[PDB]
Design a protein around this motif. Structure first.
Motif, PDB file in Angstrom:
ATOM      1  N   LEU A 234     -16.068  -2.263   3.203  1.00  0.00           N
ATOM      2  CA  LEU A 234     -15.534  -0.944   2.882  1.00  0.00           C
ATOM      3  C   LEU A 234     -15.512  -0.710   1.377  1.00  0.00           C
ATOM      4  CD1 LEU A 234     -12.575  -0.719   5.422  1.00  0.00           C
ATOM      5  CD2 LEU A 234     -14.832   0.361   5.575  1.00  0.00           C
TER       6      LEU A 234
ATOM      7  N   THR B 176       0.814  -1.208   0.000  1.00  0.00           N
ATOM      8  CA  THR B 176       0.000   0.000   0.000  1.00  0.00           C
ATOM      9  C   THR B 176       0.854   1.268   0.000  1.00  0.00           C
ATOM     10  OG1 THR B 176      -0.234  -0.086   2.419  1.00  0.00           O
ATOM     11  CG2 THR B 176      -1.959  -1.129   1.100  1.00  0.00           C
TER      12      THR B 176
ATOM     13  N   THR C 288      -8.268  -2.578   4.652  1.00  0.00           N
ATOM     14  CA  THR C 288      -8.510  -1.321   5.353  1.00  0.00           C
ATOM     15  C   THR C 288      -7.576  -0.220   4.853  1.00  0.00           C
ATOM     16  OG1 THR C 288      -9.299  -2.463   7.354  1.00  0.00           O
ATOM     17  CG2 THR C 288      -8.653  -0.152   7.582  1.00  0.00           C
ATOM     18  N   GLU C 289      -6.313  -0.573   4.632  1.00  0.00           N
ATOM     19  CA  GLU C 289      -5.328   0.378   4.128  1.00  0.00           C
ATOM     20  C   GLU C 289      -5.712   0.909   2.751  1.00  0.00           C
ATOM     21  OE1 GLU C 289      -1.157  -0.665   4.466  1.00  0.00           O
ATOM     22  OE2 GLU C 289      -1.630  -2.157   6.005  1.00  0.00           O
TER      23      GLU C 289
ATOM     24  N   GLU D 263       0.372   4.166  -3.048  1.00  0.00           N
ATOM     25  CA  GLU D 263       0.146   5.597  -2.879  1.00  0.00           C
ATOM     26  C   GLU D 263       1.144   6.417  -3.689  1.00  0.00           C
ATOM     27  OE1 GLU D 263       0.412   7.024   1.164  1.00  0.00           O
ATOM     28  OE2 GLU D 263      -0.976   8.673   0.750  1.00  0.00           O
TER      29      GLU D 263
ATOM     30  N   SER E 127      -8.796   0.821   1.315  1.00  0.00           N
ATOM     31  CA  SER E 127     -10.042   1.569   1.435  1.00  0.00           C
ATOM     32  C   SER E 127      -9.796   2.994   1.927  1.00  0.00           C
ATOM     33  CB  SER E 127     -11.008   0.851   2.375  1.00  0.00           C
ATOM     34  OG  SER E 127     -12.195   1.603   2.551  1.00  0.00           O
ATOM     35  N   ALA E 128      -8.835   3.149   2.831  1.00  0.00           N
ATOM     36  CA  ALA E 128      -8.468   4.464   3.343  1.00  0.00           C
ATOM     37  C   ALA E 128      -7.960   5.354   2.216  1.00  0.00           C
ATOM     38  CB  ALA E 128      -7.418   4.333   4.434  1.00  0.00           C
ATOM     39  N   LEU E 129      -7.052   4.810   1.411  1.00  0.00           N
ATOM     40  CA  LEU E 129      -6.497   5.534   0.272  1.00  0.00           C
ATOM     41  C   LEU E 129      -7.564   5.908  -0.759  1.00  0.00           C
ATOM     42  CD1 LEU E 129      -3.138   3.588  -0.175  1.00  0.00           C
ATOM     43  CD2 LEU E 129      -3.437   5.959   0.577  1.00  0.00           C
ATOM     44  N   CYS E 130      -8.524   5.013  -0.971  1.00  0.00           N
ATOM     45  CA  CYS E 130      -9.588   5.243  -1.948  1.00  0.00           C
ATOM     46  C   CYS E 130     -10.525   6.381  -1.546  1.00  0.00           C
ATOM     47  CB  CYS E 130     -10.385   3.959  -2.193  1.00  0.00           C
ATOM     48  SG  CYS E 130      -9.489   2.692  -3.113  1.00  0.00           S
ATOM     49  N   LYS E 131     -10.877   6.430  -0.265  1.00  0.00           N
ATOM     50  CA  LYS E 131     -11.737   7.487   0.252  1.00  0.00           C
ATOM     51  C   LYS E 131     -11.012   8.827   0.166  1.00  0.00           C
ATOM     52  CE  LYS E 131     -14.974   4.588   1.405  1.00  0.00           C
ATOM     53  NZ  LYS E 131     -16.232   4.512   0.613  1.00  0.00           N
ATOM     54  N   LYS E 132      -9.702   8.788   0.388  1.00  0.00           N
ATOM     55  CA  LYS E 132      -8.867   9.984   0.373  1.00  0.00           C
ATOM     56  C   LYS E 132      -8.689  10.540  -1.037  1.00  0.00           C
ATOM     57  CE  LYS E 132      -4.159  11.553   1.383  1.00  0.00           C
ATOM     58  NZ  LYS E 132      -2.793  11.092   1.756  1.00  0.00           N
TER      59      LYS E 132
ATOM     60  N   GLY F 121     -13.190  -5.781   6.478  1.00  0.00           N
ATOM     61  CA  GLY F 121     -13.106  -4.604   5.636  1.00  0.00           C
ATOM     62  C   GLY F 121     -13.637  -4.802   4.230  1.00  0.00           C
TER      63      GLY F 121
END
Ligand SMILES: Cc1ncc(COP(=O)(O)O)c(C=O)c1O
Ligand SMILES: Cc1ncc(COP(=O)(O)O)c(C=O)c1O
Lengths: 462, 462
Positions: free
Chosen positions: B281, B207, B243-244, B211, B246-251, B278
């Protein structure tokens, strides 16, 4: 866990079902064509949950036979006059039974090589009937939609790049099946760039207006890349001017794809084969075996004239070199092969020709009838007609025809549905059942005329 | 023409095959796992033509059983350690027989409404296990490939327009299934715009490097729109950091799609369910029932968190408003429902967990073995390992491992194939057969070790 794959309870249930269903196959005539479900039936299904603990097999089977499979249109009934559920041969059924038993797949690995050989032999044979003599290719698909998108992707990759894709324009008729425009959107052609060319009184694509739309779009800066002609329209069984369209395509550097999901079977009919002259001009064609090749859903084909086009669109490595869009597939072509070997192409040809005869018989039985209008004459086993008494205005004429449809469906004698054609509600008959007789068509029409004047007199005004 | 749909020759052939096949089901152990075809067999198939005149049914039936169906990998053999042909429950077989018999379809028309009710009930239930509680949607597809493209088409229409589509970029790992990148091409994302993010030693998507590629592409002017995480990699059964990602995708305003063709079934296992934390997510997820839900090919599902996104991609009218990409479908979900009702989810759950134990047993038996390296530990019923004696250099080690694969296949005792992992040839085991035992795993490893040192001593140098 040892009773997941196989058990005696299952082995019995399978043999019992096959036995019972074969027995019920001999009393199809006594049964209604269409059995409709009540409004509480949906909740009856939704109240059965996915259980944690297993249920006894025959209890579940009975539940499916009574609460699920029961409510359907029996396409194997001679008076099921729709074509979406096609008449399914038991040879085809046998094909499914065997294929599912051995648990094999097409494509993917090389563990089942003869499966792919079988399918390839069929696709080669189908290529001959279409008019692809050079170096064709093809793949079995689940249906016409998938056949259409497969071809249109090949069309797109052959004519457009990623930077001009937004400039690409496609051309269909107002009688073209809806999956085509839907498939065009999926591969990147917006609805605003899909032209709906008007049709003749014969419901064929107006090639004059087609060229006008092409030159206009070309002048606007768009890039015309594909025309989709239909060989056997969903509504009327009409055929677009195949040679005229192909001519325009060669001229304007456009891909020519024929949607023959229904009508391509006519190629197997020596009598009516000539109606599809010029299919070999197209770059790709679709063909459903579950429609007029007497297969169960779903067994359909897409063929391309140049196999290099399928490779350029669907290859795996190195993405710049059947296939596509699936990798591993159900062995769809196996049951079709079995059907061809057992029945032969001659017999299948004869059956298709009988379909034409059935529609003709429906028209011949409608001619002496008063106030019955033929919206579309008997064409490719199809006919569209309506009961239009001069007394009732436009609106109440449409409601009348819909009431006639409900009346015959509830009677359980025949399956006839309504379609909108030329702005007016119209009764439609597609008769392709190999064992349907002239008496079937005559009585049905007579029964329709009866309901027609029954509801006519029920219009007590004012 | 009256012998096209049904005849006594067919009714007998159907009953005979079903009866005979059930009898041979009791002697699967006596039979080899993989039966391979000779090099003349293809020509043996190509020399049988599509006849004009029909052939007697049982003549054709025998021909397919011996010359076509015979050459396959028996996935119902406890020591068939691949998963592409999955272990097929006879309940699923029964489901196929019934579905094909009644000749019904899902979607399309409204003649078979309970069919769609049944499928919808399953899709809703499957949504619960994934973690879609808000307002999910879904459609049965022919396989994972179809599931991927359906979701990725939804991803594209939600994030890109037609004029910036060429700027869109997608992100996967070097362990992501090949169907994903292929599907990306189909919907308009060129291979040059599909980033292959490197993986851990645990074969999970990095991940961090992900990024970096996103920020680099964003700076270059590209539009990052989707990341495809895999829940259960084809090779090792590894799971990307859900989870990692999904976090990047929302961001970064990106669509998150999970490829759970294989691994999504673990949600049904109460013991190992937590491995897929997750999944809810993601905006979409794929799921094959023919992999770990013990179904015949092909029965797969694709689920989205917001059903409106599927509507926007696949609606028919007015193209600006299940579905997609098909209109009428085979009633794929019916056989899964039958399986769910008959076996229950607990029993299916227990089988999945047994799959884990089998892989573990393979590793436990490999530890005492000398010169056997564990490339990937027992993870999601999968394990990758190799025999690497220090005497043989890199190249002859790979040749060694391939010969071991051939040696055990010809013995017909077990089916074990080779996969390339971390640059080196590696033996792979996927054990998901519900009735496979520890003796099955132990003897298999012991037999591999035997062949390992047999070919070792055959390296007479120099
Ligand atoms: C002319 C035509 N094209 C395409 C199709 C494909 O539609 P479906 O996906 O429902 O099989 C059909 C119906 C058809 O009649
Ligand atoms: C991880 C994964 N994704 C996708 C697929 C879909 O492949 P197929 O179309 O052969 O079912 C499979 C195989 C798979 O294991």
């Amino acid at each position: 866990t040892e009773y997941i794959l196989n058990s005696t309870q299952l082995e019995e249930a399978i043999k019992s079902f096959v036995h019972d269903f074969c027995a019920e196959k001999h009393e199809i005539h006594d049964q209604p064509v269409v059995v409709e479900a009540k409004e509480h039936q949906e909740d009856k299904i939704k109240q059965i949950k996915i259980p944690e603990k297993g249920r006894p097999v025959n209890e579940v089977v009975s539940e499916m036979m009574n609460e699920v499979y029961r409510y359907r249109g029996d396409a194997n009934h001679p008076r099921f006059f729709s074509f979406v559920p096609g008449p399914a041969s038991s040879v085809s059924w046998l094909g499914d039974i065997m294929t599912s038993a051995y648990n094999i797949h097409a494509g993917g690995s090389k563990l089942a090589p003869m499966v792919n050989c079988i399918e390839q032999e069929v696709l080669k044979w189908l290529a001959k009937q279409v008019g692809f003599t050079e170096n064709p290719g093809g793949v079995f698909v689940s249906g016409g939609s998938m056949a259409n998108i497969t071809a249109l992707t090949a069309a797109r990759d052959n004519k457009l790049t990623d930077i001009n894709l937004h400039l690409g324009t496609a051309y269909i008729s107002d009688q073209t099946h809806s999956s085509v425009a839907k498939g065009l959107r999926i591969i990147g052609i917006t609805d605003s760039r899909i032209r709906r060319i008007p049709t003749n009184s014969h419901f064929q694509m107006d090639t004059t207006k087609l060229e006008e739309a092409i030159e206009t779009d070309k002048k606007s800066g768009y890039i015309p890349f594909v025309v989709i002609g239909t060989a056997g329209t969903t509504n009327t069984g009409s055929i677009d001017p195949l040679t005229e369209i192909s001519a325009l395509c060669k001229k304007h550097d456009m891909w020519f794809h024929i949607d023959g999901a229904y009508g391509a079977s006519v190629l197997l009919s020596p009598k009516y084969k000539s109606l599809l002259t010029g299919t070999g001009l197209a770059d790709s064609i679709s063909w459903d075996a579950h429609k007029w090749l007497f297969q169960t859903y779903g067994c359909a084909m897409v063929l391309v004239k140049d196999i290099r086009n399928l490779f350029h669109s669907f290859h795996v490595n190195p993405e710049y070199l059947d296939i596509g869009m699936e990798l591993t597939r159900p062995a769809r072509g196996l049951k079709l092969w079995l059907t061809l070997q057992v029945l032969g192409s001659d017999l299948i040809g004869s059956a298709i020709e009988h379909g034409f005869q059935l529609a003709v018989w429906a028209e011949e039985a409608l001619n002496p009838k008063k106030d019955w209008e033929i919206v579309s004459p008997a064409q490719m086993a199809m006919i569209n007609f309506r009961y239009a008494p001069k007394d009732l205005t436009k609106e109440e004429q449409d409601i009348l025809n819909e009431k006639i449809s409900h009346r015959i469906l509830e009677s359980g004698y025949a399956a006839i549905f309504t379609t909108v054609l030329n702005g007016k509600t119209v009764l439609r008959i597609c008769a392709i059942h190999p064992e349907a007789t002239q008496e079937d068509m005559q009585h049905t029409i007579d029964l329709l005329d009866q309901y027609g004047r029954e509801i006519y007199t029920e219009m007590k005004k004012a």
